[PDB]
Structure 1
Amino acid sequence: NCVADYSVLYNSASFSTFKCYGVSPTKLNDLCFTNVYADSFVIRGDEVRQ
């Protein structure tokens, strides 16, 4: 029951995202989705393909 705005990744710094961006890449913010459940985990990130 929220907004789930994407103002955080507008400017950002580097990053790679999920590399799909099906609708409006780098714009998004057009679909509501059920929730923004974000599990807590940290990885090295070099093996981003896996």
Structure 2
Amino acid sequence: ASVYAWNRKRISNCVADYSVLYNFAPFFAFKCYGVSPTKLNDLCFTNVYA
């Protein structure tokens, strides 16, 4: 979608593995606030929006 029509989504009830990302692309911009990406896979969350 375009910038003024961003595509909100909710993602719950799942065993979420954040290492499927790394097979995607060179990832020009990838920076996390409040949590380090390396120690992400272990932690649990309330509600994950994308």
TM-score using structure 2 length: 0.43
Higher fraction of strand: 2
TM-score by length of 1: 0.43
Higher relative contact order (Cα pairs below 8 Å, separated by 6+ residues): 2
